[PDB]
């Protein structure tokens, strides 16, 4: 089936508690298995200790950055940058698993986390996922953001990995 991951996140060195998200392998193989690759840290490198760098209140909890920790950086697994795999699954709700991007076929490792559903981003951002459990930490992250996005507390992914 499907993988399984988990992103255990702390805030300002306390644990928030675990993500577990089901990435749609069935639909964006490729997005899939990235993100799948980056949870493990099998290739070198990956989410662990990385942060969520920008959080909008009532929007979404954006992180992947782990070059630059500031929304410049990351990159993939096949390489910097990597095609958008389509654009099947839609930004239903609360709780869907996305690519950040800078543009057309421009995915690396940042990801978001809705807090609402946000339908103007589809056909803009690859959907990959959703929240199977832990959404009551996402809203504990979604708290410490702003309008600006600008973060109150250091949001940190303490552990990653898969769980099937
Ligand atoms: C049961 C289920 O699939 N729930 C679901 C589906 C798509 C997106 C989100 N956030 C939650
Ligand atoms: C400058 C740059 O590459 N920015 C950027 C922003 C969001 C996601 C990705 N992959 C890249
Ligand atoms: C981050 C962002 O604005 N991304 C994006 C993706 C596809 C088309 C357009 N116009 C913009
Ligand atoms: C197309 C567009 O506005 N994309 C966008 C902008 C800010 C944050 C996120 N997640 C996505
Ligand atoms: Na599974």
Known sequence: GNPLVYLDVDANGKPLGRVVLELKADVVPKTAENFRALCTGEKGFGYKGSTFHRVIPSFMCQAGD???????????????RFPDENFTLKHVGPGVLSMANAGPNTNGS????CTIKTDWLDGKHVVFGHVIEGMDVVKKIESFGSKSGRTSKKIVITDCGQLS
């Open 66 to 80: 782990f070059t630059n920790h500031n929304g410049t950086g990351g990159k993939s697994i096949y390489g910097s």
């Open 110 to 113: 940042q990801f978001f986390i």
